[PDB]
Amino acid sequence: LRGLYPPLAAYDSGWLDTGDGHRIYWELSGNPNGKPAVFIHGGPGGGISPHHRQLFDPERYKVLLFDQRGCGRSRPHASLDNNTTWHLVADIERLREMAGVEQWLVFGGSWGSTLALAYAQTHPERVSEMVLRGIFTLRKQRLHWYYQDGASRFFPEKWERVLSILSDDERKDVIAAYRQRLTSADPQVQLEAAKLWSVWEGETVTLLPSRESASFGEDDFALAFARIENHYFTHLGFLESDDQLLRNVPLIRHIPAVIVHGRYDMACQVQNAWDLAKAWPEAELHIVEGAGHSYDEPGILHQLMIATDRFAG
Ligand SMILES: CC(C)(C)c1nnc(C(=O)[C@@H]2CCCN2)o1
């Protein structure tokens, strides 16, 4: 099984002012003359990791990685002002012009696959190839599955913790209930709910229990993670219709793509990947047996490495 390339530092980085109150952190890794690619992290509000650099051949790729508005090293931290899907799409174009890229490979998993699709369908001309993982298209059925009733049935003991702070009425609409707390004037109220929300996800993204999950409970990370995620879900991803990302697939069918999805992905059902593949025959679908959601699930990582390697010749 293929693994990550060796660790390496970015060769350049900085903050880009968007003009509307945001300074987004970005970095360039790999070969300044290599094949251009952009990495889109998940969440939303998840942030990039130095390990995301090791997903592309150091000798053949010129990788641009960045923290989306309000998370990671992008300022202001945990900000929900001017933080929507369409602003992020604009941010990607801004970063592309900065790095002087005319066209690049879009690598995105989870919410990153959601933004990757939104971006690609808005600027088809700027996308050379796509590598998608753990497909998430933001349909009501998807949000209901992970945050109302669905995954809850596979992790009943964990789901009870999420509901522990809600009254009987609030439990009717968990997303809405958490929205109130996450937007409370009381920082303590925000943090208590941010932690519960983030740990739920942290403990359900891998087939087997991981020690990595504990980091989802870290105060600063959790605060921005939960606030931003809940904000996007409260607004239905700022899409004009439930299946926007699926009905606009015709706009990108000519683009070479690889879809990798874990069979037992509990955050995003494999049905999403199947639905996408059905509308996108050209794409190559890889359903990884025995794997969960996370990009570093052995079998999922293996397919990701092979995909980027092949697209780089
Ligand atoms: C693996 C990665 C860090 C990209 C990740 N983990 N979870 C996500 C998400 O985008 C999930 C999907 C529903 C809500 N948050 O993305």
Side-chain angles (χ1 to χ4, degrees):
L1 290 178
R2 301 272 296 92
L4 296 168
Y5 281 100
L8 79 168
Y11 67 74
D12 197 7
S13 65
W15 276 262
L16 166 61
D17 197 278
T18 62
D20 51 46
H22 291 276
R23 290 180 301 162
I24 54 184
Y25 176 79
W26 60 267
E27 66 183 25
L28 287 171
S29 176
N31 185 319
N33 298 95
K35 177 180 171 58
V38 63
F39 176 82
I40 307 180
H41 73 240
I48 60 174
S49 166
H51 296 303
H52 299 317
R53 300 184 201 123
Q54 322 173 214
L55 285 166
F56 310 76
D57 182 296
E59 301 167 47
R60 272 156 282 288
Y61 276 109
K62 174 192 184 181
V63 191
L64 184 295
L65 311 92
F66 69 108
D67 280 328
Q68 290 151 47
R69 302 189 172 200
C71 75
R73 280 187 275 182
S74 290
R75 311 302 189 195
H77 177 264
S79 169
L80 300 185
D81 304 305
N82 280 183
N83 200 338
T84 78
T85 305
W86 308 114
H87 286 93
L88 303 186
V89 170
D91 286 353
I92 296 169
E93 277 299 72
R94 290 195 188 71
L95 287 165
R96 190 188 95 291
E97 307 209 69
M98 174 192 88
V101 178
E102 190 70 0
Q103 190 176 59
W104 54 9
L105 176 159
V106 178
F107 184 107
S110 218
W111 150 262
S113 75
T114 314
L115 185 52
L117 289 176
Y119 175 64
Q121 303 175 337
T122 300
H123 305 294
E125 62 273 24
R126 307 299 184 176
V127 186
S128 58
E129 38 259 53
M130 304 181 82
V131 181
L132 308 176
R133 179 273 307 181
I135 305 304
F136 188 36
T137 65
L138 235 308
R139 292 177 288 187
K140 285 284 301 181
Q141 67 192 70
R142 346 284 246 40
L143 298 177
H144 181 80
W145 159 266
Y146 202 36
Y147 302 106
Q148 191 54 53
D149 176 56
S152 50
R153 290 173 171 179
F154 282 92
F155 303 88
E157 81 279 27
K158 298 186 183 297
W159 187 239
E160 287 193 4
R161 280 187 295 171
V162 172
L163 306 179
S164 70
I165 59 171
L166 311 184
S167 73
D168 286 286
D169 306 296
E170 303 186 295
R171 304 186 178 192
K172 304 287 187 178
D173 191 320
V174 177
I175 290 173
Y178 270 73
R179 171 68 171 181
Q180 291 308 80
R181 295 174 169 64
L182 289 169
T183 62
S184 175
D186 183 345
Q188 311 303 169
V189 171
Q190 293 191 179
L191 187 66
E192 157 180 270
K195 286 182 171 176
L196 285 174
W197 174 284
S198 307
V199 174
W200 159 250
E201 181 162 332
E203 296 180 0
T204 55
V205 293
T206 56
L207 193 86
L208 299 180
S210 160
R211 289 192 185 70
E212 290 293 303
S213 66
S215 62
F216 277 71
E218 286 189 55
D219 289 41
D220 281 61
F221 166 76
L223 196 285
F225 187 66
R227 270 171 63 82
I228 294 173
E229 274 195 345
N230 180 291
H231 172 69
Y232 275 68
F233 301 163
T234 290
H235 299 77
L236 293 311
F238 305 91
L239 298 173
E240 46 200 3
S241 71
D242 199 56
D243 62 354
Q244 188 185 315
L245 297 186
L246 282 179
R247 76 164 175 299
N248 287 328
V249 168
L251 298 58
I252 62 178
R253 290 186 51 184
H254 64 288
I255 303 173
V258 176
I259 300 170
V260 185
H261 204 113
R263 171 71 72 184
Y264 298 103
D265 183 334
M266 286 292 136
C268 308
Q269 302 190 97
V270 66
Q271 177 74 48
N272 301 336
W274 182 255
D275 286 352
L276 183 58
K278 279 292 185 183
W280 198 352
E282 296 85 356
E284 299 184 2
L285 175 68
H286 293 283
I287 295 180
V288 186
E289 305 291 353
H293 181 63
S294 190
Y295 87 100
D296 58 3
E297 285 281 281
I300 293 173
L301 179 55
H302 178 74
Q303 293 289 165
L304 293 178
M305 298 314 289
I306 288 171
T308 60
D309 275 346
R310 59 165 298 200
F311 278 132

